[PDB]
Design a protein around this nucleic acid. Structure first.
Ligand SMILES: [Cl-]
Ligand SMILES: [Mg+2]
Length: 439
DNA sequence: GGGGTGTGGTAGC
DNA sequence: ATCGCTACCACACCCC
């Protein structure tokens, strides 16, 4: 048991946090792409005609946690029992659940308490622990297999278990559904073999957005090939509005109010107008949705194809701790800020950069929100506050950065006992070069 | 035309 | 118990 005023807190929290792991894994995969390809040219140009294979493990954490489960769970059956991955027994997030669990209505992001009530009498929920190092090892096998197949011109990491793979089609070659289907089956079988039993689904298309939609249709343990020429009202009828990439809960609600609760993407595409959509959700996101309903990518999405090395370059660095934050006084808050700055400066030094702009963000208990939230050590319902500072000279000096961070906290006027979360950010990074002569 | 800030949404499981 | 991260885009609203 490690409290937020213990020196070991950041280490322990990050060791247990699957969301920390997801972000750290992704950052590491981006860095590896850059190192792997530093003398390989890997971009897409205006002259290229290409096909997208969007590949994702099926219920990744639950699959791997099951395959590596301890002997206590030896008689667990992945095809017959409902399985979740989580830390706890009550208000603990279900990070991943298998398709048996989903068949009873259990969904990721539910709390264990919630999901247990959906099970009929006699049927027990199997809760597996996280197996973080095994998640990483299976990801290594995944990316190694994709490269070894030598069928892709560009392999872009999306996440620990998800990649966008691009195949350039020369105009002298006649691409067919049969070639694409056999490629999907080769990929699926090789990954199944290479990971000792994990399955992937694949969406295959001539746009990023359609390959993402095709992938959703392919799950679980399957593939789907839907090109722009194959588009149909039946396709668009298959999807909810937040199945579109970049449409979450908040955008979904805006679309339902504006366009009288469209049920499917086919509903939305027959009702919307471009200006009404831009007014509803914003100009750029409205244009993105407009283009996606034609199966087309927007300019922003295509950037990763045209210059992946620039897109995958890290441009900021931060930590967020919004669980376990219970401080009694400002001395302990300040020590925690100092530990956070030390951690961030270690990362900043690892990548040989300085920073010229920093931000402190905090979560403060809402006035009407309960003092102890329903979730043990949760932030509960909170108000967001942030303040940023431009440093004079770009720096990696602890004295400068930690002092300014503590001063930023001071200016936001959050009493320590109302603090429920903190984020420390280096917003602008500057390269360290061989010439550090400056008057 | 250029610049700036704080706030909020989204994605991976 | 329980581990609600984090990079990036985009917006509203301020200034020359
Ligand atoms: Cl999952
Ligand atoms: Mg979505």
């Amino acid at each position: 048991i490690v409290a937020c005023d213990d020196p070991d807190f950041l280490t322990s929290y990050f060791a247990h946090s699957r969301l920390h792991h997801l972000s750290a894994w992704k950052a590491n995969l981006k860095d590896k792409f850059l190192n792997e390809n530093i003398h390989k040219y890997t971009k897409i140009t205006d002259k290229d005609t290409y096909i997208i294979f969007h590949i994702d493990f099926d219920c990744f954490f639950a699959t791997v946690a099951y395959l590596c489960r301890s002997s206590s769970f030896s008689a667990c059956d992945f095809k017959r029992d409902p399985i979740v991955v989580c830390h706890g027994t009550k208000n603990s997030d279900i990070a991943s659940c298998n398709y048996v669990a989903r068949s009873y209505g259990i969904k990721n992001g539910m709390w264990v308490s919630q999901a247990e009530k959906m099970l009929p009498n006699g049927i027990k929920l199997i809760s597996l622990p996280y197996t973080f190092e095994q998640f990483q090892l299976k990801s290594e096998a995944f990316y190694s297999t994709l490269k070894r197949l030598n069928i892709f011109n560009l392999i872009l990491p999306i996440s620990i278990d998800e990649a966008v793979c691009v195949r350039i089609i020369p105009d002298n070659i006649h691409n067919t559904n049969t070639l694409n289907a056999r490629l999907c089956e080769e990929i699926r079988q090789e990954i199944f073999q290479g990971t000792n039993g994990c399955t992937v689904s694949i969406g295959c298309s001539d746009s990023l957005v359609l390959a993402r939609l095709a992938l959703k249709m392919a799950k679980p343990n399957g593939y789907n090939i839907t090109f722009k020429s194959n588009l149909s009202e039946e396709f668009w009828s298959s999807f909810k509005l937040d199945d579109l990439p970049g449409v979450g809960h908040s955008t979904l609600s805006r679309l339902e109010s504006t366009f009288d609760s469209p049920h499917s993407l086919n509903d939305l595409r027959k009702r919307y107008t471009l200006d009404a959509l831009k007014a509803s959700v914003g100009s750029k996101l409205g244009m993105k949705i407009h283009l996606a309903l034609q199966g087309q990518d927007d300019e922003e999405s295509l950037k990763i194809l045209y210059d992946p090395k620039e897109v995958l370059q890290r441009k900021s660095l931060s930590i967020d701790i919004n669980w376990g934050i219970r401080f009694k006084n400002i001395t302990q808050v300040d020590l925690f800020i100092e530990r956070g700055c030390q951690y961030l400066l270690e990362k900043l030094n690892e990548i040989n950069k300085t920073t010229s702009q920093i931000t402190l963000k905090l979560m403060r208990r809402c006035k009407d929100a309960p003092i102890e939230p329903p979730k043990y050590m949760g932030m509960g319902r909170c108000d967001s506050f942030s303040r940023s500072s431009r440093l004079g000279i770009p720096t990696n000096e602890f004295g400068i950065i930690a002092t300014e961070m503590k001063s930023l906290y001071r200016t936001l006027g959050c009493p320590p006992m109302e603090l429920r979360g903190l984020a420390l950010q280096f917003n602008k990074l500057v390269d360290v070069g061989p010439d550090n002569n400056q008057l």
